[PDB]
Design a protein around this ligand. Structure first.
Ligand SMILES: Nc1ncnc2c1ncn2[C@@H]1O[C@H](COP(=O)(O)OP(=O)(O)O)[C@@H](O)[C@H]1O
Ligand code: BEF
Ligand SMILES: [Ca+2]
Ligand SMILES: [Ca+2]
Ligand SMILES: [Ca+2]
Ligand SMILES: [Ca+2]
Ligand SMILES: [Mg+2]
Lengths: 148, 744
């Protein structure tokens, strides 16, 4: 897309491989829903169909990364950008206490098909844990999200 | 040092060790035989795969893609009954010469529906499916070009394409069945047993499946090229005439073979010069196909009569007719609805006057060929009437025509076929170049300096107006006293300086130097020099039946016999084909095109008998080595993240081996510091420059501790990537659910 920076597009490309598990560079509605459900959403097939029809220029029913990029695009009031990050965090912080715990990270990773050990989950937490309290808060989550 | 591939006179290549380097050539020691040595040109010796037992589905997965590693790869696959292999998008298919289990089953067909090349093992089905998907998605007609020498499997792989499409995308559509049931009919009139193939196609064909705007089949069309005329009257020691003759002689009802005065094939001259050939059963299979496409019993009879007519015409012996023949002539003139007198008159006398034995023979055969050839024209056209259409939006076209191959004596027929393959080869070069450019652009690989050099000058030599060989030939047919020798001199004088033309006596081969300058020429075809003996070029360039004989048959008693002919007596065979060939390229050039290279593994029709030198020659002749050279200019080694991950996860720390393939490979690039020049982390694959894959392979195989070390130095970065992957995925799901709202 043209509203996204180089950095931003790079991160989504990586995020995209999570839908595109087979690594052929294209996803269908099947893979769109599976991932969305894994992150606590639940679109109806009709809803996916409608959304995918905007960017699916051919009739194939499958899309690729740049079509994906535009499928995520929309008109946003300033408040919407931060509201979204704030809400992604709350996908991790499942109990709303303001801190992502190791058990919680573990929940998201395993939900997304990521394979890692408990020790490695602790490591992930530790590396994001800037203030050293052993969990991840909002500011720390944002910092990690936007860092090369 | 490391074993390498070097030339071998019967295996094509053999393993050996370089024992000595020279400025021009290398000294090789064949693996087995210490003390033995031989020389090979430096450019004829090739690096080998470390693992001589592995096999890959796409030759681009090889560490070293070259004619030797390619030959060896398909060889291992073929030994395990895997006859299909890719070179990027090109399908190589090696004739197995026996029926391999499961590979062509209806179930196996289902497993290919909708799948991209690479997601299943290489297969003719994948190529068929891709033509249909590109048609439907790209809104662009599609061609699948199936080439190879006689016996290589072009006709079989063409049937597999039609079968796959019919079962996959034509369930309720009978048009598909009429198209599938067409080939049995064509094969009867156009195929024949030769020493190279028991079911050799004696004509070229293009099969078009036509579609409407909704990928629904609306009709079909069949183009046929270069029917082998000479086979109608005389055939080689160990060959036969067209199937239909023997099929009708061994399958006709007691009644019919009585109405048509038919006996065993041994009773006819045209069949005189059959254990594995089920003429009887094939007759039955043919009649089935006729009912299946809509031939009435009357047409079936009309065709048969003419076939029979032609048979008796060949029995008439000579002067005038003996008595053995007056029964033949009687039968003949009755089946072709002719006046027994005018016929005998026409076979024995000419207007310019009496005829010798020879001249009466030529006139009998000439008429026979013309009748049969028109019969065949009528048949192919009949087939097109089983699925006509006034309009359509797209087609999928499958080309089934004989490639370049070696003959002891090259006459006009080889000249036409080699002309054809020059133009197809050009098309093929153009197309592989475009795919490669397209790939390099999609993945950011840059430029490739390597370019196939054009063969347009060779094509022009043959086909250019006024000065091309075909026009020079036509002039000769129009001269008062046409001569093969005068023709040949005309060509030499006109093209004395042509890069592509040579005089036979310049050859390194003594048998060619024996040919006088005005009796042949050598043309430097794409695949190599071909020495043409031009004797008979003038006669063979002529499809026209003498006026007297043609009148006899045009004004005939039988309406069907007259309808075959609804069309100086000269019709140029060369130029007629030129026009057909040019129409065919117009169509191909408007399509997206795929290529199936059929390889005949040996000259004995046996299974599991890989003749390396014979196969290497087909790979070379069919342009494949040309492709490998193009690939060497850029990134000839291409591996998916998945493929790399399975190959190398075992050499990495368990913590890394736990990542997904994409992130695994991404980590290897970072930990190894791989130079962006040599290595390209693509959209879905890693692209390596020549040698760089083998180099990366050595790195993975080096000191495990140091490797773990490199990975550790990149740990913070890896953990961050993993955070970002899941974090941004999360933002993604959210932006998506917000879009679902936005649209309501
Ligand atoms: N894939 C295959 N499976 C089984 N038999 C095959 C296959 N390809 C070819 N054959 C055998 O080889 C013979 C010649 O193949 P064909 O398609 O006629 O070659 P071409 O059309 O290239 O002259 C066929 O009659 C068949 O016996
Ligand atoms: F002989 Be095959 F038909 F080319
Ligand atoms: Ca996919
Ligand atoms: Ca799409
Ligand atoms: Ca929490
Ligand atoms: Ca913290
Ligand atoms: Mg054939």
């Amino acid at each position: 897309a043209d509203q996204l920076t180089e950095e931003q597009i790079a991160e989504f490309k990586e995020a995209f491989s999570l839908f595109d598990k087979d690594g052929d560079g294209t996803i269908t509605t099947k893979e769109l829903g599976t991932v969305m459900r894994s992150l606590g959403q639940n679109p109806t097939e009709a809803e996916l169909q409608d959304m995918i029809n905007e960017v699916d220029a051919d009739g194939n029913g499958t899309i690729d990364f740049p079509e994906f990029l535009t499928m995520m695009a929309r008109k946003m009031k300033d408040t919407d950008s931060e509201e979204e990050i704030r809400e992604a965090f709350r996908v991790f912080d499942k109990d709303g206490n303001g801190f992502i715990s190791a058990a919680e990270l573990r929940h998201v990773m395993t939900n997304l098909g990521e394979k890692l050990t408990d020790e490695e989950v602790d490591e992930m937490i530790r590396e994001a844990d800037i203030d050293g309290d052993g969990q991840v808060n909002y500011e720390e989550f944002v910092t990690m999200m936007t860092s090369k | 040092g490391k074993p390498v591939w070097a030339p071998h006179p019967t295996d094509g290549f053999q393993v050996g060790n370089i024992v000595d380097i020279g400025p021009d050539s290398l000294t090789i020691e064949p693996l087995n035989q210490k003390g033995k040595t031989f020389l090979a040109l430096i450019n004829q010796v090739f690096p080998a795969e470390e693992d001589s037992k592995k096999d890959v589905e796409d030759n681009c997965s090889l560490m070293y893609l070259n004619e030797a590693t390619l030959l060896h790869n398909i060889k291992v696959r073929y030994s395990k009954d895997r006859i299909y292999t890719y070179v990027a998008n090109i399908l190589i298919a090696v004739n197995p010469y026996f029926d391999i289990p499961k590979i062509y089953s209806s179930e196996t067909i289902k497993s290919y529906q909708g799948k991209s090349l690479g997601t299943m093992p290489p297969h003719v089905f994948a190529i068929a499916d891709k033509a249909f998907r590109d048609m439907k998605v790209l809104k662009l007609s599609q061609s699948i070009i199936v080439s190879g020498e006689s016996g290589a499997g072009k006709t079989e792989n063409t049937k597999f394409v039609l079968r796959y499409l019919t079962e996959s995308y034509g369930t309720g559509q009978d048009i598909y069945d009429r198209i599938v049931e067409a080939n049995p009919l064509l094969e009867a009139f156009g195929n024949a047993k030769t020493v190279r193939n028991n079911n050799s196609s004696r004509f070229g064909k293009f099969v078009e499946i036509h579609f409407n705007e909704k990928s629904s089949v609306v009709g079909g069309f069949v183009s046929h090229y270069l029917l082998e005329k000479s086979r109608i009257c005389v055939q080689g020691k160990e060959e036969r005439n067209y199937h239909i003759f023997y099929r009708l002689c061994a399958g006709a009802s007691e009644d019919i073979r009585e109405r048509l005065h038919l006996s065993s094939p041994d009773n006819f001259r045209y069949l005189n010069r059959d254990p594995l050939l089920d003429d009887h059963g094939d007759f039955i299979r043919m009649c089935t196909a006729m009912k299946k496409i809509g031939l009435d019993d009357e047409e079936k009879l009309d065709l048969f009569r003419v076939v029979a007519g032609v048979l008796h015409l060949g029995n008439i012996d000579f002067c005038n007719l003996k008595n053995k023949s007056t029964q033949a002539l009687e039968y003949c003139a009755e089946l072709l609805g002719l006046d027994q007198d005018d016929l005998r008159v026409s076979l024995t006398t000419r207007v310019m006057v009496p005829l010798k034995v020879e001249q009466a023979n030529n006139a009998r055969d000439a008429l026979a060929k013309t009748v049969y050839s028109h019969l065949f024209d009528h048949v192919v056209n009949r087939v097109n009437q089983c699925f006509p259409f006034e309009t359509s939006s797209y087609f999928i076209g499958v080309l089934d025509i004989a490639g370049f191959e070696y003959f002891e004596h090259n006459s006009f027929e080889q000249f036409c076929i080699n002309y054809c393959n020059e133009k197809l080869q050009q098309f093929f070069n153009e197309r592989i170049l475009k795919e490669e450019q397209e790939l390099y652009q999609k993945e950011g690989l840059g430029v490739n300096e390597v370019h196939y050099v054009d063969n347009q000058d060779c094509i022009d030599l043959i086909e250019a107006r006024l000065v091309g060989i075909l026009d020079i030939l036509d002039e000769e047919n129009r001269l008062p006293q046409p001569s093969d020798q005068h023709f040949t001199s005309a060509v030499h004088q006109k093209h004395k300086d042509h890069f592509r033309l040579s005089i036979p006596r310049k050859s390194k081969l003594a048998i060619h130097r024996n040919i006088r300058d005005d009796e042949g020429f050598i043309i430097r075809h794409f695949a190599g020099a071909v020495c043409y003996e031009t004797t008979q070029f003038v006669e063979k360039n002529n499809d026209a039946l003498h006026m007297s004989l043609e009148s006899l048959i045009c004004e005939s008693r039988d309406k069907f016999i007259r309808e075959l002919f609804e069309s100086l007596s000269f019709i140029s065979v060369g130029n007629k084909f030129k026009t057909q060939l040019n129409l065919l390229l117009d169509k191909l050039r408007s399509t997206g095109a795929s290529f199936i290279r059929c390889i005949k593994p040996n000259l004995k029709m046996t299974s599991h008998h890989f003749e390396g030198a014979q196969i290497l020659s087909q790979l070379q002749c069919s342009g494949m080595v040309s492709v490998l050279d193009l690939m060497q200019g850029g990134f000839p080694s291409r591996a998916s993240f998945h493929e790399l991950y399975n190959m190398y996860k075992k050499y990495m720390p368990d913590k890394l081996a736990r990542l997904d393939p994409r992130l695994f490979c991404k980590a290897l690039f970072k930990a190894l510091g791989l130079n962006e020049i040599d290595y390209k982390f693509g959209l879905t694959k890693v692209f390596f420059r020549p040698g760089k894959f083998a180099e990366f392979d050595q790195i993975m195989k080096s000191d495990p501790d140091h490797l773990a070390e490199l990975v550790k130095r990149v740990n913070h970065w890896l953990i961050c990537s993993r955070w970002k992957k899941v974090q941004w995925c999360s933002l993604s799901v959210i932006k998506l659910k917000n879009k679902i709202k936005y649209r309501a």
